[PDB]
Nucleic acid binder design. Structure first.
Ligand code: MG
Ligand code: ZN
Ligand code: ZN
Lengths: 34, 46, 196, 67, 49, 192, 258, 115, 49, 51, 147, 240
RNA sequence: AGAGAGGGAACCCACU
């Protein structure tokens, strides 16, 4: 189902997933890689 | 007269000479680290 | 909710951010496409029925705090400040002494400023967990008092505690490297390391 | 890096509390319960452990240059 | 051999790509370093976008 | 010397208790903001139906813009006045403003009651996107919140859109400060 | 024209702190006694650190700093020690110093904690205070080591904060401000002190113009270098000694003028 | 660099007088007592004790600068009564009450530790 | 640098979420030098075929 | 002088116990670069004791 | 003194003076400030976030948890922070009765106190102090050197 | 080229002839100090032990200057240069034989500057004449320029990392000129708007506004503590 | 007891 009011802790889970997958310097590394 | 250097990655020590190319004997690592001085140090604990 | 359930249990389900991108839940919107998108700020306010504003949302912002940079993310309550103050703090935050790197004992950096007892902030943001500011911090939590006094915190100055400083308060250490090599040349000038 | 020996404000000896603080944390206590289980009433002594980052454990991973 | 081109750290053609943090600490490189910079004559260079 | 040494006995501070007004003042501020917002909305609905008549000397869009800016400035002034009637004579913001040492009434109004309208180049926040200021607003939205008016104060904090518009205003101020210096110095050099 | 008679009433006495009340004395006397608690009480602390060898991740001066702030048991030796600069010895002796030796090398894969226990004194009485765990000086990886000799000398809190025996000296007079020295804007919001004696209906005591500060409440928590009561005894002795020396110089100056 | 050594707070030097008496010339029976290498932790008590005399018309003290370790205690007493006498009586009164306080603290310790 | 105009330096509306609104060098390079936002990502580009 | 560049130990005075290196020396006094503090201070030759 | 410190809100400033612990003011308990900042730095700069950080720091250091300071929360306003601080035996708005460090008489005003997060900037005064007197001289023209 | 060497803001005419590098100048951060007069600047010792004033040997000061020369250099009270009658410089930092350390009337002694010496204190954007004023030297321990609070307003220096430039007038004639023209007491009222530029700065202003209120009353001890700090007090406690 | 110093130009980041 949906996240009615535990959204405050649910959004930071996806933020953590993004920054564990990508990182802070994906621009430089991916640009030089391509 | 020879100076003792610590062989970087090897962490072993060896002698060195004047006008001697800087090489370790274990694996020829180029980076040497000079040993700590033998004279006394005294620190005010402040 | 199932996405959150599979996303909390990372390193077990191998459910990454890329899997959520593949699931058609999030997508990357660039600046051209922002001109033709109806963007919800937060879901708890802009999907519930009210005196309706638009009721035609296409995308929703993940979290508004992600509009800020890396140095504006370490500011506690940056929306309560004034914007020039936030800019000046963004300037100063790239200048605070601290453990700039973990292997600083190996690096022969010029002008290495490191600190004795850096601390994580008691008042932190959620975004510091992703800049890893709690692992290589820059600054110490200090018991400040905002008081007029003898007259040495007059015009943008602060009175410090001598005993606290003697207890290692902000006592930093400054490293400076010096490099020099000799030059084998055409025998006219020949540098060599020796005690003169 | 390593835990300060004294609280900056008080001078209360807090350097001997860090390992016990970690033990109380891994023994399923709250941080507030662990602090006053160690006996830290003043919040200036509480911030010394509550906001410390034990960075020296990161520095001990590297092999010592001198040996 | 055409020539040597610089490599920014933590790339897919750097030595320490995908290495574990223990391996990085064995190489005297910290896992905290994000890379993305070139080492030119020992100087760390950043290509500003 | 002697006033500092008396200040040692007296002591002077500033805090978060000096930035909070009683709930009656907050109710007054919120009522004024709501009334002004509804007034702006009804002015907008007059402008849509061509019932707004143009002031002699400018276009209809500006009769409208003058009306909106007038209403919002009146709201800012009224909320500031109603905020600065509730210091209770011990508020340190009033202590510094009345003495004239640091600050003014505008700072008190912005901290306690409302930041006010944010401006770029003397007018409201322009439509950077296609006929909207930010992608969160519907197109052709000439309301207070869409065009840069901030109804929150520094005590309550700004919503992200208000934060961005406030950052725009601060950027304009910093640009002015950074560009003024060289021209002023050159004028001084020529004059001397 | 003379000094009032003060009196002491001790509410509790623990190995950490002492809590007492001093009545019938002036405010300046009470504040000075607090300041002499913080500063003028001499204890024994490490001040001369000679690093024979060091391979730890922490540098030499960081280790010397951490050795400075370690409290030492000086309950009875500090009264016998001369100040180091006042001694006629050959720049160090057991009459103005206490010798400590640290000699630790880590020969195991476990992280070896060089604690305060590894500090070995030649004087059995002057030992580090550490039931409680030891004070962590430096952690050691395998292959690292540190050897040092540290001389501790007598000093007080004005010189450096490592000679401060007190963890915290709480001091307050008139907990319900009948003197009205502090003026609350809204006294209802203000929590009562530990020594307040007003009922929960009342916020603060009525004002009296003829009153004066008296009945000062102290909470002197020691850091372990001294027992909390010998801190007070040494403080009173030190303040009396300072006044006596001031009187002696005063007598010399008066005799010089006449 | 320019950090004063930590012993500048309390240690005198050769050619430094601990106490210097300068007779004031503005009003009769007034003296400035310049105490070297001291702070408020002496002058405050001396001032408070000198205010308890019924024959001291003015009792004050100030530090010229917190970075320079000296205080000046200004004493104006009633005529027929020298300010130096008031000073040397204030010191004795302070010593008396402090010794009495120390003895009473000893008695309190003996009461508390022995029940 | 050193231009008396303001339009290349101002905080445009389309800087929302892509670039930080607060962080900038406040010298003579206000608005010109910017710092990227957190979740903002520069598309590395692919072939249109 | 002979004392120049000689590790000395202040054996008398307020700075007693400090190890330093003599930078300048005279008949009366000598400047000592202290190993502990970031400061070079001058003391009498009668107060110095070489290692 | 002269060393340049700064908050996390653009509230920079050099060290004016350093008092010892006995000269620094103190609360009813033994807590003295580590830093004492100017009250006049607030009203014109309008860093209310600094005050809120101080209040949340008191709440966090008493509660035993690292406080949350995300900008756009709506779950943490100043009133909730004050209500959480009131439970730990403090004033609602973080004010605390400081006693004077010199005279001992309690300060008439109630000083706002609490823990913030201060940053020491790279800028010392030893790196910036320099004097000169007929030292090195340029060769192109006989004027003193630069830097 | 030569035209490029002359035409610039870094050339010969502006860059070298108009604004040139000068000896006898110091630059360090300023920190506030309310315990010294408005015409006093608290300079560090290491700055005062490096900037010298050429004092002429006269029979009035021959013993004092002789003692300062006996101290030599780095004994703060000391000097570093002693200039002969024929313009010959003799070092005091290199410790010559005691034979050529005499003083007769006519010698110059470049001695380290002490308390009471006059210096020129300025900030960078000297937009008016009160941005560059003369102060009296006070020797304070730490390594900053301790200057007063009310002089902030003409200087526009807010102590948040500001560093000032301190020039030393070398001649006695220019010292008297600075004392008689560019003293901050003589630069209180500006000619641009016939008003003072010093004023009373923030904290003193607020404390004096709260101080002079009607409901402010002072106990006798507090009154004596306050009157201790009046420099212009004739020693008479006013009637309450 | 043997006593002076030099580079120079270019370009980046901050500092008030
Ligand atoms: Mg400034
Ligand atoms: Zn090897
Ligand atoms: Zn001895």
């Amino acid at each position: 189902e949906i996240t009615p009011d535990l959204w405050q802790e649910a959004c930071w889970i996806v933020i953590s997933s993004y920054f564990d997958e990508k990182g802070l310097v994906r621009q430089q590394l991916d640009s030089f890689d391509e | 007269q020879p100076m003792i250097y610590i062989c970087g990655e090897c962490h072993t020590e060896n002698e060195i000479k004047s006008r001697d190319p800087i090489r370790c004997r274990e694996c020829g690592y180029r980076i040497m680290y000079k040993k700590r001085t033998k004279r006394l140090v005294v620190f005010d604990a402040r | 909710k199932r996405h959150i359930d599979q996303l909390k249990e990372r390193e077990y389900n191998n459910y990454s951010w890329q899997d959520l991108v593949a699931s058609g839940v999030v997508e990357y919107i660039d600046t051209l496409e922002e001109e033709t998108v109806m963007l919800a700020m937060t879901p708890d306010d802009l999907q519930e029925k009210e005196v309706a504003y638009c009721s035609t949302y296409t995308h929703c912002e993940i979290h508004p705090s992600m509009i800020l940079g890396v140095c504006a993310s370490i500011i506690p309550f940056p929306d309560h400040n004034q914007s020039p103050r936030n800019t000046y703090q963004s300037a100063m935050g790239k200048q605070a002494m601290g453990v700039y790197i973990t292997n600083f004992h190996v690096r022969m950096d010029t002008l290495a400023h490191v600190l004795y007892y850096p601390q994580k902030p008691l008042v932190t943001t959620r975004s510091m967990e992703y800049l890893r500011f709690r692992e290589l911090p820059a600054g110490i939590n200090s018991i400040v008092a905002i008081a007029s006094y003898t007259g040495y915190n007059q015009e943008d100055s602060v009175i410090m505690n001598r005993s606290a400083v003697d207890r290692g308060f902000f006592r930093s250490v400054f490293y400076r490297s010096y490099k020099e090599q000799e030059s084998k040349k055409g025998f006219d000038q020949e540098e060599v390391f020796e005690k003169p | 890096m390593i835990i300060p020996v004294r609280c900056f404000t008080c001078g209360k000896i807090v350097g001997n509390k860090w390992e016990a603080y970690l033990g109380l944390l891994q023994a399923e206590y709250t941080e507030g319960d662990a602090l006053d289980a160690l006996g830290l009433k003043r919040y200036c002594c509480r911030r010394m452990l509550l906001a410390h980052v034990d960075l020296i454990e990161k520095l001990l991973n590297y092999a010592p240059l001198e040996k | 051999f055409i020539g040597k081109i610089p490599i920014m750290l933590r790339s897919t053609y750097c030595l320490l790509n995908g290495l574990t943090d223990r391996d990085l600490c064995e190489l005297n490189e910290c896992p905290l370093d994000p890379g993305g910079y070139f080492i030119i004559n020992g100087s760390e260079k950043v290509l500003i976008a | 010397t002697v006033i500092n040494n008396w200040l040692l006995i007296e002591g002077h501070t500033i805090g978060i208790g000096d930035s909070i007004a009683d709930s009656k003042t907050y109710q007054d501020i919120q009522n004024t903001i709501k009334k002004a917002k509804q007034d702006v909305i009804e002015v907008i609905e007059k402008a849509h139906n061509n019932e707004l008549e143009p002031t002699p000397g400018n276009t209809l869009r500006q009769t409208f813009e003058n009306q909106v800016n007038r209403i919002l400035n009146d709201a800012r002034d009224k909320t500031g006045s109603s905020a600065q009637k509730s210091l209770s004579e011990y508020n340190n913001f009033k202590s510094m403003v009345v003495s004239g040492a640091k600050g003014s009434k505008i700072n008190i109004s912005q901290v306690i009651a409302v930041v006010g309208q944010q401006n770029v180049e003397g007018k409201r926040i322009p439509f950077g996107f296609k006929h909207r200021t930010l992608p969160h607003f519907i197109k052709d939205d000439y309301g207070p919140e869409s065009r840069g008016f901030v109804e929150n104060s520094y005590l309550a904090g700004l919503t992200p859109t208000e934060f961005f518009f406030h950052a725009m205003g601060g950027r304009e101020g910093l640009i002015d400060t950074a560009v003024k210096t060289a021209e002023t110095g050159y004028i001084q050099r020529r004059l001397i | 024209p003379y000094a009032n008679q003060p009196t002491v009433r001790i509410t509790e006495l623990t190995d950490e702190n002492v809590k007492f009340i001093i009545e019938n004395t002036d405010l300046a006397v009470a504040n000075s006694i607090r300041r002499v608690f913080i500063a003028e009480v001499p204890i024994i602390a490490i001040d001369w650190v000679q690093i024979d060898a060091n391979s730890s991740v922490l540098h030499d001066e960081f280790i010397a700093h951490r050795l400075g702030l370690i409290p030492l048991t000086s309950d009875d030796i500090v009264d016998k020690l001369q100040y180091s600069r006042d001694c006629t010895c050959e720049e160090f002796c057991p009459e103005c110093s206490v010798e400590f030796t640290l000699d630790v090398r880590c020969n195991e894969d476990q992280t070896r904690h060089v604690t305060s226990r590894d500090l070995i004194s030649n004087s059995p009485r002057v030992i580090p205070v550490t039931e409680q765990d030891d004070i962590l000086i430096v952690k050691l990886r395998k292959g690292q080591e540190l050897r040092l000799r540290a001389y501790a000398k007598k000093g007080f809190g004005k010189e450096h904060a490592k000679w401060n025996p007190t963890a915290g000296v709480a001091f307050e007079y008139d907990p319900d401000n009948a003197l009205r020295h502090t003026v609350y804007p809204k006294p209802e919001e203000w929590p009562k002190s530990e020594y307040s004696e007003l009922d929960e209906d009342e916020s603060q005591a009525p004002y009296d113009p003829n009153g004066k500060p008296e009945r000062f409440y102290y909470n002197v928590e020691s850091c372990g270098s001294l027992r909390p009561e010998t801190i007070v005894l040494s403080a009173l002795s030190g303040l009396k000694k300072k006044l006596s020396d001031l009187q002696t110089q005063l007598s010399h100056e008066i005799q010089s003028d006449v | 660099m320019n950090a004063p050594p930590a012993f500048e707070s309390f240690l005198l030097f050769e050619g430094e007088k601990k106490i210097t008496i300068n007779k004031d010339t503005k009003v009769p029976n007034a003296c400035l007592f310049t105490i070297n290498k001291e702070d408020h932790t002496l002058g405050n008590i001396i001032k408070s004790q000198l205010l308890k005399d019924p024959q001291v018309l003015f009792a004050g003290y100030k530090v010229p600068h917190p970075l320079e370790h000296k205080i000046i205690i200004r004493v104006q007493t009633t005529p027929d009564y020298s300010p130096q006498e008031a000073f040397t009586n204030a010191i004795t009164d302070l010593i008396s009450e402090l010794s009495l306080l120390e003895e009473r603290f000893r008695v309190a310790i003996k009461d508390k530790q022995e029940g | 640098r050193d231009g008396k105009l303001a339009k290349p330096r101002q905080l445009h509306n389309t800087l929302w979420g892509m670039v930080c609104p607060a962080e900038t060098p406040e010298g003579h390079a206000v608005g010109l030098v910017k710092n990227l936002a957190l979740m903002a990502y520069i598309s590395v580009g692919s072939q249109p075929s | 002088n002979e004392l120049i560049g000689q590790t000395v130990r202040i054996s008398q005075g307020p700075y007693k116990g400090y190890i330093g290196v003599v930078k300048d020396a005279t008949e009366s006094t000598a400047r000592v670069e202290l190993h502990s503090t970031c400061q070079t201070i001058s003391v009498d030759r009668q107060r110095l004791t070489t290692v | 003194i002269g060393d340049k410190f700064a908050s996390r809100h653009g509230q920079k400033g050099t060290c004016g003076i350093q008092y010892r612990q006995e000269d620094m003011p103190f609360t009813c308990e033994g807590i003295t400030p580590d830093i004492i900042i100017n009250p006049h730095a607030i009203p014109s700069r309008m860093t209310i976030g600094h005050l809120i950080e101080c209040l949340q720091g008191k709440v966090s250091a008493n509660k035993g948890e690292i406080g949350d300071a995300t900008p756009f929360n709506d779950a943490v306003n100043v009133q909730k922070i004050s209500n959480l601080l009131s439970d730990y035996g403090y004033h609602l708005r973080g004010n605390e009765v400081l006693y004077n460090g010199f005279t001992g008489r309690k300060i008439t005003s109630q000083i706002f106190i609490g823990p913030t997060y201060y940053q020491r900037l790279k800028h010392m005064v030893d790196d910036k102090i320099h004097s000169r007197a007929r030292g090195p001289i340029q060769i192109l023209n006989r004027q003193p050197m630069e830097g | 080229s030569l035209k490029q060497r002359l035409k610039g803001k870094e050339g010969r005419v502006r860059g070298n002839l108009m604004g040139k590098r000068v000896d006898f100048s110091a630059r360090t951060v300023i920190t506030p100090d309310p315990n010294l007069s408005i015409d006093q600047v608290g300079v560090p010792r290491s700055i005062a032990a490096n900037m010298t004033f050429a004092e002429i040997v006269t029979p009035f000061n021959i013993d004092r200057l002789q003692e300062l020369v006996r101290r030599g250099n780095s004994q703060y009270p000391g000097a570093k240069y002693i200039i002969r009658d024929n313009g010959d410089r003799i070092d005091l930092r290199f410790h010559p034989k005691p034979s050529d350390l005499h003083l007769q009337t006519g010698y110059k002694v470049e001695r380290h500057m002490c308390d009471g010496d006059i210096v020129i204190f300025n900030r960078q954007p000297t937009l008016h004449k009160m941005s560059m004023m003369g102060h009296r030297v006070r020797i304070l321990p730490w390594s900053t320029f301790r200057l007063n609070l009310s002089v902030t307003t003409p200087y526009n220096a807010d102590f948040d990392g500001d560093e000032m430039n301190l020039h030393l007038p070398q001649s006695l004639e220019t010292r008297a000129e600075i004392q008689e023209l560019a003293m901050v007491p003589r630069m209180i009222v500006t000619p641009q708007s016939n008003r003072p530029v010093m004023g009373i700065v923030q904290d003193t202003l607020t404390a004096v506004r709260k101080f002079t209120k009607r409901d402010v009353f002072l106990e006798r001890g507090e009154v004596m503590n306050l009157l201790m700090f009046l420099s212009t007090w004739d020693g008479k406690v006013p009637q309450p």
